[PDB]
Ligand binder design. Structure first.
Ligand SMILES: O=S(=O)(O)CCCN1CCN(CCO)CC1
Lengths: 173, 173
């Protein structure tokens, strides 16, 4: 029951710009059944980096790519949920982390981050719509204006308006 | 929740830098430390790792792992080390000499042949003959660091070896 180990993007599937990349699909019952086969990677002529579940056609679509791969695009759909394997979503930062899209949602000192769509505890104007491509979803640490400290978030502690999250540099030698 | 973590049996982490924080508590099983780590409540930092002391039945939580500056692995028969995968780099630099993540599937989807096994392919790569290199479990690895990145022997008798499909850190934005 591994569905809680993927990063969920609602109302979304990915489209094969490229004719070259490949796909598996199976009609099924629940998105769980979909996690488990991506997690286990059985019966797949490729590495499962993401799956979509189609709540209307009850289908799973397992992918050897994700939303960040070249020659692939998101497509909208009320019936689609996308789930990307945390293993192929880069979990360190490059530079100041303008493009960090990992799922760490805790500040350096352990404070659970406050949702970008929320104004509680803290009022702010970093609307997700005002920052498209900067993936200000859920309560993830993000550095949307690409500032000095790397990814930060508003804090769910009313006494701490914000704080850096402590995410490692990919390469600093 | 004790599977979002990479387990090194028989291992713990000593801190040099005695300013890095640490919480410990006498708990009952290793699972009960995973959960407290995973939801990070009551720990004044970001839990990147924990150790379970099977003797003392104690847990030791850390805001660092075995790739952190200022900390050493250490053999201890009574310990087990569990590192949060968000903080083990999931991304390859160059040939992947130092790739220590948990991916175990080849690029065309075939499950990896464990290094501690000569079936179906026989080989010159035991763990302790190649120490420092983490030829642990069935993890995609690159011990001699050679052109196409981490690879493994393959559970499929027709395919001796194949590289895995681990992204470069340079792949994405
Ligand atoms: O201006 S707001 O309070 O709405 C957001 C403030 C966050 N910034 C503060 C300075 N660094 C944070 C790192 O300490 C960059 C982001």
């Amino acid at each position: 029951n591994t569905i809680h180990e993927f990063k969920k993007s609602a109302k979304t599937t990915l489209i094969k710009i490229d004719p070259a990349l490949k796909i598996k699909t199976k009609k099924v019952n629940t998105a769980d059944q979909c996690a488990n086969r991506c997690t286990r990677n059985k019966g797949l002529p490729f590495t499962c980096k993401a799956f979509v579940f189609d709540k209307a056609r009850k289908q799973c679509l397992w992918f050897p790519f994700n939303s960040m791969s070249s020659g692939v695009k998101k497509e909208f759909g009320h019936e689609f949920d996308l789930y990307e394997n945390k293993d192929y979503i880069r979990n360190c930062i490059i530079g100041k982390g303008r493009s960090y899209k990992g799922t760490v949602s805790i500040t350096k000192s352990g404070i659970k981050c406050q949702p970008w769509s929320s104004m509680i505890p803290h009022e702010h104007s970093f609307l997700p719509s005002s920052y498209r491509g900067k993936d200000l979803q859920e309560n993830y640490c993000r550095n949307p204006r690409g500032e000095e400290g790397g990814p930060w978030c508003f804090t769910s502690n009313p006494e701490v308006r914000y704080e850096v999250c402590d995410i490692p540099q990919c390469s600093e030698v």
